[PDB]
Each structure stands twice: as structure tokens, then as C-alpha cells.
Amino acid sequence: YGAAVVNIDLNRDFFDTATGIDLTKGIPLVQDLLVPIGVTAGAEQSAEY
Amino acid sequence: VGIPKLEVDHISFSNVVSMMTANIRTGDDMAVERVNPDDVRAINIRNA
What we know:
Shape of chain A: elongated
Largest sheet of chain A: none
Oligomer: part of a larger assembly
Number of strands of chain A: 0
Distance between the termini of chain A: 36 Å
Largest interface: A-B, 6 and 4 residues
Structural class of chain A: little secondary structure
Number of helices of chain A: 0
């Protein structure tokens, strides 16, 4: 009695945080698979989606 | 009427045109910034 919001997403268990991906935001974010070769320092932070 | 000071052949003592400033001092100079395009990958060269 008193739930503000419920919802559906990716199970933070089958997709473990250690050996594979990560989910703190909604998007399942992995580190370095497709990094844009030649840009500034703050870029590529979206190509990790 | 009135022949120009030259081509008449005699030395004289006439007038000039001057100003007040030191010119090079305003305490400033053209100050411009430039922003880099960004990526070298997607710059357009093909304008002919």
C-alpha cells in the first residue's frame, strides 16, 4: 500500500553487472565496442548505447 | 589659377597636415576567438 510507480525493463540478474553489461540508467550500457575514432574527450559517451 | 608648388623651381616654406593621437595606443587590439570544427572525420572538403 503506497507504490508510486512500477514498470518493466531488463532483469539486472540474467544480464549480470560484472561479466557483460550494466544498467543504472534505463539503457543497457556496455563499455568499449564501437568508439568513434577521431573526436574530442567528451564524445563517444553515447556510442556506448 | 595658381601654379602648383612643384615645377616652378623655387624653395619655399608652406603648410602640412597633422593629427593628435599616438595611433598605436588604444589600450587594445583586435581580439578574436576561434572554435574548432570538432571531428576530422566528417569535415566537408568537396565544395570544388
